[PDB]
Amino acid sequence: NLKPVDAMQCFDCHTQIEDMHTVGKHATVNCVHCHDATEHVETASSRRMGERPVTRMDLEACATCHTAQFNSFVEVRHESHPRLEKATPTSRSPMFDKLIAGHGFAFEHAEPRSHAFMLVDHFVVDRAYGGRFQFKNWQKVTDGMGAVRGAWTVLTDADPESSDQRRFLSQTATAANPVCLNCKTQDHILDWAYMGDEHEAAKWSRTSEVVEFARDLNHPLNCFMCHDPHSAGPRVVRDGLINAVVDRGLGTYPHDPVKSEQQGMTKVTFQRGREDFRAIGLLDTADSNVMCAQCHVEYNCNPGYQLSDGSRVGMDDRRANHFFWANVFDYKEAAQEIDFFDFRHATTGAALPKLQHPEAETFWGSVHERNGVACADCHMPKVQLENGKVYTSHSQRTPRDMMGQACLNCHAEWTEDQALYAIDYIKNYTHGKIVKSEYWLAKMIDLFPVAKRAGVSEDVLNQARELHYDAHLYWEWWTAENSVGFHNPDQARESLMTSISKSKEAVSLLNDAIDAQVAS
Amino acid sequence: NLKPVDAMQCFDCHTQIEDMHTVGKHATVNCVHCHDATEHVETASSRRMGERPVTRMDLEACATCHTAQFNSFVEVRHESHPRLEKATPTSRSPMFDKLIAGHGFAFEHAEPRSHAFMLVDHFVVDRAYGGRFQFKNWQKVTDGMGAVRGAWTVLTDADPESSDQRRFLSQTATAANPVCLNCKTQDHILDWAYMGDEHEAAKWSRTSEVVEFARDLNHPLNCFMCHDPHSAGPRVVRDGLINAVVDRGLGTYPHDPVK
Amino acid sequence: NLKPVDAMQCFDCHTQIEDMHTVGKHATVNCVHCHDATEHVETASSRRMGERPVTRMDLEACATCHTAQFNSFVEVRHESHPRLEKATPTSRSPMFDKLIAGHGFAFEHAEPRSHAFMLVDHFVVDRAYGGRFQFKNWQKVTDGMGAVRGAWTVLTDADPESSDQRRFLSQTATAANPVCLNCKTQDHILDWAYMGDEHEAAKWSRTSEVVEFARDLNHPLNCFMCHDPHSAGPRVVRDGLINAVVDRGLGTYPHDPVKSEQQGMTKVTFQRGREDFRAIGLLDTADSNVMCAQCHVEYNCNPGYQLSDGSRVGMDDRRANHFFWANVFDYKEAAQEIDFFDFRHATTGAALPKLQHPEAETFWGSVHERNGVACADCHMPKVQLENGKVYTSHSQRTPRDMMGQACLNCHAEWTEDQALYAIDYIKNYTHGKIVKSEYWLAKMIDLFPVAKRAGVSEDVLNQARELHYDAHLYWEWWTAENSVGFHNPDQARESLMTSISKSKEAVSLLNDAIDAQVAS
Numbered sequence A, C: 001n002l003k004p005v006d007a008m009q010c011f012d013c014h015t016q017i018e019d020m021h022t023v024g025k026h027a028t029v030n031c032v033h034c035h036d037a038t039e040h041v042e043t044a045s046s047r048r049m050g051e052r053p054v055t056r057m058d059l060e061a062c063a064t065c066h067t068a069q070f071n072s073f074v075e076v077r078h079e080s081h082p083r084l085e086k087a088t089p090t091s092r093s094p095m096f097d098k099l100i101a102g103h104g105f106a107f108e109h110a111e112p113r114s115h116a117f118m119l120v121d122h123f124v125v126d127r128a129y130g131g132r133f134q135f136k137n138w139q140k141v142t143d144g145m146g147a148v149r150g151a152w153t154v155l156t157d158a159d160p161e162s163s164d165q166r167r168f169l170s171q172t173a174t175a176a177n178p179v180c181l182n183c184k185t186q187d188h189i190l191d192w193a194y195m196g197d198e199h200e201a202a203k204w205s206r207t208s209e210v211v212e213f214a215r216d217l218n219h220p221l222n223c224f225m226c227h228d229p230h231s232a233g234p235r236v237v238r239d240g241l242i243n244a245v246v247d248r249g250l251g252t253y254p255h256d257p258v259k260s261e262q263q264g265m266t267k268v269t270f271q272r273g274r275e276d277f278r279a280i281g282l283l284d285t286a287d288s289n290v291m292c293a294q295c296h297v298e299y300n301c302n303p304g305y306q307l308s309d310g311s312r313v314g315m316d317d318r319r320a321n322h323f324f325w326a327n328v329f330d331y332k333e334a335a336q337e338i339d340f341f342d343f344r345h346a347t348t349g350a351a352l353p354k355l356q357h358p359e360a361e362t363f364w365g366s367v368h369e370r371n372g373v374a375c376a377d378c379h380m381p382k383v384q385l386e387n388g389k390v391y392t393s394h395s396q397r398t399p400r401d402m403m404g405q406a407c408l409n410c411h412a413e414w415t416e417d418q419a420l421y422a423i424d425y426i427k428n429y430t431h432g433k434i435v436k437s438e439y440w441l442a443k444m445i446d447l448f449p450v451a452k453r454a455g456v457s458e459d460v461l462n463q464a465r466e467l468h469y470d471a472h473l474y475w476e477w478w479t480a481e482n483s484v485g486f487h488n489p490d491q492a493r494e495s496l497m498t499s500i501s502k503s504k505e506a507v508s509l510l511n512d513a514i515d516a517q518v519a520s
Numbered sequence B: 001n002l003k004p005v006d007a008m009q010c011f012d013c014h015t016q017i018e019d020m021h022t023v024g025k026h027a028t029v030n031c032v033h034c035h036d037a038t039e040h041v042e043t044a045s046s047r048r049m050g051e052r053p054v055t056r057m058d059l060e061a062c063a064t065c066h067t068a069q070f071n072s073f074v075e076v077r078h079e080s081h082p083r084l085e086k087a088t089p090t091s092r093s094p095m096f097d098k099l100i101a102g103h104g105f106a107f108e109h110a111e112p113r114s115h116a117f118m119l120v121d122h123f124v125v126d127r128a129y130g131g132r133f134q135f136k137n138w139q140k141v142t143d144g145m146g147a148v149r150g151a152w153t154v155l156t157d158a159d160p161e162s163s164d165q166r167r168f169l170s171q172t173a174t175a176a177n178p179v180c181l182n183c184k185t186q187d188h189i190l191d192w193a194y195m196g197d198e199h200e201a202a203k204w205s206r207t208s209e210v211v212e213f214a215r216d217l218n219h220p221l222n223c224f225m226c227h228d229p230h231s232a233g234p235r236v237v238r239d240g241l242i243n244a245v246v247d248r249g250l251g252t253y254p255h256d257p258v259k
Ligand code: HEC
Pocket: A025, A026, A029, A030, A033, A061, A062, A063, A064, A065, A066, A223, A224, A227, A229, A231, A232, A233, A234, B064, B065
């Protein structure tokens, strides 16, 4: 049984915590729920930590008083098909392997499944750790609660004796690095300096051995990623997001200065040895658009190359942890502003960006976003109970599972079937354009070896490579983005038509150049 | 937002609560969750209460940290047919009127329905208060959450100006008395002496005017009827039960001394 | 009404039958249920048959006393989509036509459907008889009971006047030969010598005119394929299987000598004119792993070519009826041991194997097989009845239709949805790797004409052809195998990664060789 500690004693040294804790809705929640600080209190001074207190980061620390939210979070949506590869004819990107050739995603890229699995899925995907980590057996893939209890309760490491990234199976990659983990867990929140920069007080950083870092991490999507444990108020903890919104002053809604001001973020910095160490972003309001944008964004979390000179940009560089915080039509400019690209296409040699799940940036400017709707309205609605205390569902899943609460409450003119039909109209239309964009990209890509072998000049190949960048960007955004156009159908339409235009331009350029070589 | 109070100061006078609270699973739960004792602490001595502190008896006091248990409790089972009279050919006792003739149950005795309604159903049944109390309208009969929030949020009193038990409709009875309420609520747990005996410190007792008592009561089946708020440990609070089991030495299982 | 015959009279000459019949559970079942032997008994001698007795091979011969088993067998699973071509984007092998080009399966290869249809489906598939046989009309495709009553009750022959294999429609093949029928029916069990070898007493053999043979055959999957009609004990009748397990001494579980000994097979030979003629394999136990392995295996049942010198191996050769009885990683060695391959790829010219439904060999060594689980546990479980005499369901179908009896009885920790999710995780993962294997095989195949035309040497082409063999084998096993990895997910994973490795090696070899030619 827990025994309370005297928080006044802590507050003597922890003024920032005092100011948060005493004012919020956790003012009566004793520190012992999450911290074991006995030896810390015996040894600390006002500027030196002394013995490190233990801080609980398990979600059960919150589930004791918030079982409803915890249970809704950990529910596994069995209809979210697991380990479903996107590069197949029946999934999101039928020609993905040809289009992404040269990139680590060619090894495996599955559709997302329920949040409980995020950390385990990150660890076991074929592109991440060379196949080092596996579930203990193939039955464990169902065990959401187990994954939440801790990744290492359900996973095995092929070689606990080594800590290097290497292939354990031939068709795997070792793309994982420490930045990835920031969107899977915040178990490292006290051990990682802001942005993963080198820091005396940080156990882990962008340049750490990711296998060793992995072994230290257990829990997915900690509840405190969106809720300050001290004030219980809304926040974000993701460094990349704070950096974009606050440090770079882009604001929470870069396209709406007024909304950015009303629904803003306040950066709170915590120090170690009186030197800035870590930060959180306190939100003005409980704005799930910004909470979900901690992870559902396009980002860099990887080494890459400079657009200017093609030189390597390694994990040690700040750019290896970066939120572009730019919609699809501002993205090329945002990548130019940091002088960065992700990979060279294996066939065309083009410098290309790699886009990932840009839901937050896609949502900006959509009809729903403009009308003050937020992710949670459709994906974590309040529960409707005939007789019950209302709480917010933490199931984070498609509104198809709860259309009454997620759509039909606003769309009184529709039945569930009508609303589903509206969704399907958009997704079907968008998917048709994605498929057409891929057809044209693939047609362009296939001409590169023919052009090279026909003696087409490097100048013409480079012209086509520049078009490839744009054709790729304006296509890939939409296979990366999870709503298949729903979050912003007009933007998807304009973008995908732009992709096709670019590819058609490249096809015509290469075809003409090949024919001119043949004629000469 | 709640501000915690200095529980150690309470414990200077409240040794019994200290021994329960500091040992159980509510040792970290501050008194401010259930008591407003500011003026009490200002005026009390260990021998004089001073200002009476306020104690929350609402189930929301527990639902804050125990929403899953509260929500399962308050759910209304619509399949438990409401206001279904047992003295009919299709219910439990087709000849009940003949057999029970001379007893107040002849006026109305329905099947039970979900616990959320126990106090409101007690107040509105035809045999209890002469028809004095009704739901605010016939729609309110569905409102389990409302009844749990408080009986008087969903009921009306035909005559707030009188406190006597009398018939307001011809075929009703006034069988209710203060003892009934002990199986409907424990909102009176600090205002009722053991067994409802007369007591200088008891606002209410077996001989109280039941209508006046009724008006003071709000919540059905308080969570603390089975769970001690201080220790979080299992308990009962019903005097009649404690009297049988302990005072009369019958034990919890009168047919099984080992159990 | 049947009238019993005096079996003692038969037993005077039929000692093997006496020894089986008098001891088993059919000891009270009179011969007249299945044999009309009146004129036989009048004319036979102890060594000469005299008039041939009639033997009933229709399944109704057993259905009279075993209606429950018969009815469960003949049920048509309408959810098993009929005539569903595998070489489409929504089926098992999207790039099958490119990959299998040169082989008869390019004409048509559908997913399997319910067992009642096996013989009719064999007769009507476009790759088998040149389109000679059709259902009487398109309505008859539903008639499982009709097919079971007899193929010729529901099919028509385009030309009853000729018996040659030829095309009746342009896009058909004539791949059928007599060996195929051994996995469709055993109506010929008394007319076919062991292995289909030439024999004086055999009406049919490997070299027979298959159209004439076809016309003599009526019933699918006779009940006596797994149950000896005389002893009622468990057996197999399939020559290829007996030959692998017993003649070649490979055992029923080639990877487990102990299990092979406990769950073994005893070959029983029957003679004609005191010369070995046909054989059965009596099983030590009712082991469905071995019963189903009569057909659900990789086999040769076709002409092919020698790996050594490329010469034709015709139906007359023993190798035209062969069970490799080898898992995917032992298969290349098993094909080398008989010096055999199936076809030359139409584009690459590579000698290639053709793999078919190797469920039995894939199942070996899997977690379930190692734990003593057998096909029937998942595909023909005992019926569960609140009040009823239990019998074994003969419906032979996916456990999805009976998850309570097929999985959940062993997997108490799971709900049906969890178990289905576990299956889908494996199938989704495996299918993603199949698709990737095909992508790489197709990329390799497409380089062959480019390499040939660029002047790449035969030595380099032959190197790539040798890689093609392996890339093909380690892919095709898994489109052939029906569980999409479920029966052995680790093996599927290792194999498919091997396929991709081989293809990538071939792509790199050919690309480099083409570029070197272009540069010269
Ligand atoms: C000892 C019980 C207890 C623990 C442990 C606890 N909380 Fe709370 N929490 C409360 C109470 C009490 C409230 C106030 C409820 C109210 O009045 O609305 C609260 C309020 C909240 C709110 C609403 C705050 C607001 O401003 O609306 C959030 C979000 C919350 N808690 C999250 C968490 C998270 C995340 C954890 C785990 C780090 C956690 N809590 C741990 C008891 C707890």
